[PDB]
Write an enzyme that holds these catalytic residues in place. Structure first.
Site, PDB file in Angstrom:
ATOM      1  N   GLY A  24       3.203   1.221  -2.125  1.00 33.88           N
ATOM      2  CA  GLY A  24       3.398   2.673  -1.971  1.00 33.88           C
ATOM      3  C   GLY A  24       4.813   3.022  -1.554  1.00 33.88           C
ATOM      4  CB  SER A  25       7.600   4.720  -2.805  1.00 37.56           C
ATOM      5  OG  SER A  25       8.912   5.007  -2.339  1.00 37.56           O
ATOM      6  N   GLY A  26       6.507   6.576   0.011  1.00 41.12           N
ATOM      7  CA  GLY A  26       6.302   7.930   0.564  1.00 41.12           C
ATOM      8  C   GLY A  26       7.386   8.301   1.563  1.00 41.12           C
ATOM      9  CG  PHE A  28       5.072   5.999   4.500  1.00 47.83           C
ATOM     10  CD1 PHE A  28       5.350   4.745   3.970  1.00 47.83           C
ATOM     11  CD2 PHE A  28       4.238   6.841   3.777  1.00 47.83           C
ATOM     12  CE1 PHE A  28       4.827   4.360   2.741  1.00 47.83           C
ATOM     13  CE2 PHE A  28       3.715   6.452   2.551  1.00 47.83           C
ATOM     14  CZ  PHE A  28       4.009   5.212   2.034  1.00 47.83           C
ATOM     15  N   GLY A  29       8.298   5.684   4.169  1.00 43.22           N
ATOM     16  CA  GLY A  29       9.246   4.673   3.657  1.00 43.22           C
ATOM     17  C   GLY A  29       8.777   4.089   2.336  1.00 43.22           C
ATOM     18  CB  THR A  30       9.578   1.542   0.046  1.00 45.56           C
ATOM     19  OG1 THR A  30      10.352   2.692  -0.295  1.00 45.56           O
ATOM     20  CG2 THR A  30       9.080   0.888  -1.225  1.00 45.56           C
ATOM     21  CE  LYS A  50       6.413   2.675   7.825  1.00 43.76           C
ATOM     22  NZ  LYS A  50       5.921   3.283   9.081  1.00 43.76           N
ATOM     23  CG  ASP A 142       2.153  10.896  12.178  1.00 43.73           C
ATOM     24  OD1 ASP A 142       1.501  11.822  11.655  1.00 43.73           O
ATOM     25  OD2 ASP A 142       3.029  10.237  11.577  1.00 43.73           O
ATOM     26  NE  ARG A 146       0.083  11.933   7.804  1.00 43.15           N
ATOM     27  CZ  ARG A 146      -0.453  13.077   8.248  1.00 43.15           C
ATOM     28  NH1 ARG A 146      -1.427  13.685   7.581  1.00 43.15           N
ATOM     29  NH2 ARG A 146      -0.009  13.615   9.372  1.00 43.15           N
ATOM     30  CG  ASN A 147      -0.137   7.961   9.524  1.00 43.30           C
ATOM     31  OD1 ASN A 147       0.481   7.465   8.583  1.00 43.30           O
ATOM     32  ND2 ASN A 147       0.289   9.040  10.160  1.00 43.30           N
ATOM     33  CG  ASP A 160       3.736   6.345  10.651  1.00 48.18           C
ATOM     34  OD1 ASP A 160       4.103   7.068  11.614  1.00 48.18           O
ATOM     35  OD2 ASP A 160       4.415   6.166   9.618  1.00 48.18           O
TER      36      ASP A 160
HETATM   37  C1  LIG Z   1       1.815  -0.927  10.551  1.00 41.88           C
HETATM   38  O1  LIG Z   1       3.033  -0.636   9.876  1.00 41.88           O
HETATM   39  C2  LIG Z   1       3.286  -1.324   8.725  1.00 41.88           C
HETATM   40  C3  LIG Z   1       4.069  -2.472   8.747  1.00 41.88           C
HETATM   41 CL1  LIG Z   1       4.698  -3.051  10.245  1.00 41.88          CL
HETATM   42  C4  LIG Z   1       4.343  -3.172   7.584  1.00 41.88           C
HETATM   43  C5  LIG Z   1       3.825  -2.724   6.388  1.00 41.88           C
HETATM   44  C6  LIG Z   1       3.048  -1.583   6.339  1.00 41.88           C
HETATM   45  C7  LIG Z   1       2.758  -0.863   7.511  1.00 41.88           C
HETATM   46  N1  LIG Z   1       1.949   0.294   7.568  1.00 41.88           N
HETATM   47  C8  LIG Z   1       1.521   1.050   6.495  1.00 41.88           C
HETATM   48  C9  LIG Z   1       0.814   0.772   5.341  1.00 41.88           C
HETATM   49  C10 LIG Z   1       0.177  -0.504   4.870  1.00 41.88           C
HETATM   50  C11 LIG Z   1      -0.145  -1.534   5.783  1.00 41.88           C
HETATM   51  C12 LIG Z   1      -0.781  -2.685   5.348  1.00 41.88           C
HETATM   52  N2  LIG Z   1      -1.112  -2.859   4.082  1.00 41.88           N
HETATM   53  C13 LIG Z   1      -0.846  -1.932   3.173  1.00 41.88           C
HETATM   54  C14 LIG Z   1      -0.216  -0.730   3.514  1.00 41.88           C
HETATM   55  O2  LIG Z   1       0.071   0.199   2.562  1.00 41.88           O
HETATM   56  C15 LIG Z   1      -0.897   0.623   1.608  1.00 41.88           C
HETATM   57  C16 LIG Z   1      -0.332   1.870   0.926  1.00 41.88           C
HETATM   58  C17 LIG Z   1      -1.459   2.740   0.349  1.00 41.88           C
HETATM   59  C18 LIG Z   1      -0.780   4.126   0.395  1.00 41.88           C
HETATM   60  C19 LIG Z   1      -0.053   4.071   1.763  1.00 41.88           C
HETATM   61  O3  LIG Z   1       0.345   2.684   1.908  1.00 41.88           O
HETATM   62  N3  LIG Z   1       0.695   1.990   4.680  1.00 41.88           N
HETATM   63  C20 LIG Z   1       1.297   2.985   5.342  1.00 41.88           C
HETATM   64  C21 LIG Z   1       1.830   2.444   6.493  1.00 41.88           C
HETATM   65  C22 LIG Z   1       2.578   3.239   7.472  1.00 41.88           C
HETATM   66  O4  LIG Z   1       3.175   2.675   8.375  1.00 41.88           O
HETATM   67  N4  LIG Z   1       2.554   4.598   7.325  1.00 41.88           N
HETATM   68  C23 LIG Z   1       1.821   5.298   6.263  1.00 41.88           C
HETATM   69  C24 LIG Z   1       1.473   4.459   5.020  1.00 41.88           C
END
Ligand SMILES: COc1c(Cl)cccc1Nc1c(-c2ccncc2OC[C@H]2CCCO2)[nH]c2c1C(=O)NCC2
Length: 308
Positions: A24-26, A28-30, A50, A142, A146-147, A160
């Site tokens: 995912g790219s949003g 929040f970041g990539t 992330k 937050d 989504r989170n 997040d």
């Molecule tokens: C805990 O912090 C992370 C750290 Cl240290 C490292 C990688 C990811 C996250 N965390 C997040 C994921 C995610 C986690 C683990 N596996 C997969 C994932 O992403 C999946 C995709 C689906 C749509 C949205 O993300 N996703 C989101 C986050 C986030 O931090 N904010 C919002 C979106």
């Protein structure tokens, strides 16, 4: 004489990864799907990676390392454990891969195939996470569907820690629709502010991922909530469950329920879940290796089972 934070921060090598693709790219970041192979360990840990969408800013690295600092401390089955960081051009954070995406996406994707025992179990597991953060003097600021991520349909964790802080923050760009009143007006944040967020998070799931106040520009919301209006009762919700949501959205924050209590009240409802959530064919529905099945399946270990 505040407590000393002895959390180990771990530094990982780009050599040990394999960024299979972008998950995912949003805003929040990539986030990249990856596989972390620690050297000599003879284990393959699936990971998420992330990284903010901007290239190496000095400001970007500051904020990532604050998210890293917070998640480095937390150890809970309903809160994402940071496995460590990789010190490349930009700083990269690394947690356990949560293969079924975020919960908001999941409920929208499975509107017609989610039972009450899942919805209620989720409400518990979130309240459990948020309570663990309360026990660690830590306000998330937050919380939303989504989170929240999905390790399995039976297991969710909270993610997040972008806006997270310990123990009044001067504010910038924030999600108004998930915020308490006193957080919108006076920018005062607290555990009970997250309860409001938690309330809206529950409404999110019970409406199988509706947008709260769908088509109401965010400046208006402060004016609405002051006038005593709140989110509606979802159709699948009994008064019992909706009553709990309304209690999260009280003007007086002391009068809001504590996560401690929310864990109990939802736990109770999960024992007889059809008494609390009325869903069409609720009985029939069941959810998920018969899917998973990736390249080399041998020597694969879920992060939960590794460092500990
Ligand atoms: C805990 O912090 C992370 C750290 Cl240290 C490292 C990688 C990811 C996250 N965390 C997040 C994921 C995610 C986690 C683990 N596996 C997969 C994932 O992403 C999946 C995709 C689906 C749509 C949205 O993300 N996703 C989101 C986050 C986030 O931090 N904010 C919002 C979106």
């Amino acid at each position: 004489g505040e407590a000393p934070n002895q959390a180990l921060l771990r530094i990982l090598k780009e050599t040990e990864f394999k960024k299979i693709k972008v998950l995912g790219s949003g805003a929040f970041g990539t986030v990249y799907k990856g596989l972390w192979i620690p050297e000599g360990e003879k284990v393959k840990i699936p990971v998420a990676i992330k990284e903010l969408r901007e290239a190496t800013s000095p400001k970007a690295n500051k904020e990532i390392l604050d998210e890293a600092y917070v998640m480095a401390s937390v150890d809970n089955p309903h809160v994402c454990r940071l496995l460590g960081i990789c010190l490349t051009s930009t700083v990269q954070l690394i947690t356990q891969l949560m293969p079924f995406g975020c919960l908001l996406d999941y409920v929208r994707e499975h509107k017609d195939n989610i039972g009450s025992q899942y919805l209620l179990n989720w409400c518990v597991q979130i309240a459990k996470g948020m309570n663990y953060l309360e026990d660690r003097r830590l306000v998330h600021r937050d919380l939303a569907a989504r989170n929240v991520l999905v390790k399995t349909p039976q297991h969710v964790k909270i993610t997040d820690f972008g806006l997270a802080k310990l123990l009044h923050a001067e504010g910038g760009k924030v999600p108004i629709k998930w915020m308490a009143l006193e957080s919108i007006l006076h920018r005062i944040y607290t555990h009970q502010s997250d309860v409001w967020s938690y309330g809206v998070t529950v409404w999110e799931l019970m409406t199988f991922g509706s947008k709260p106040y769908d088509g109401i520009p965010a400046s208006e919301i402060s004016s609405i909530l002051e006038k005593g209006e709140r989110l509606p009762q979802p159709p699948i919700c009994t008064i019992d469950v909706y009553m709990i949501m309304v209690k999260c959205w009280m003007i007086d924050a002391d009068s809001r329920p504590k996560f401690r209590e929310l864990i109990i009240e939802f736990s109770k409802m999960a024992r007889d879940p059809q008494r609390y959530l009325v869903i069409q064919g609720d009985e029939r529905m069941h959810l998920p290796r018969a899917l998973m099945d990736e390249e080399d399946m041998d020597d694969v270990v879920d992060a939960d089972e590794y460092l500990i």
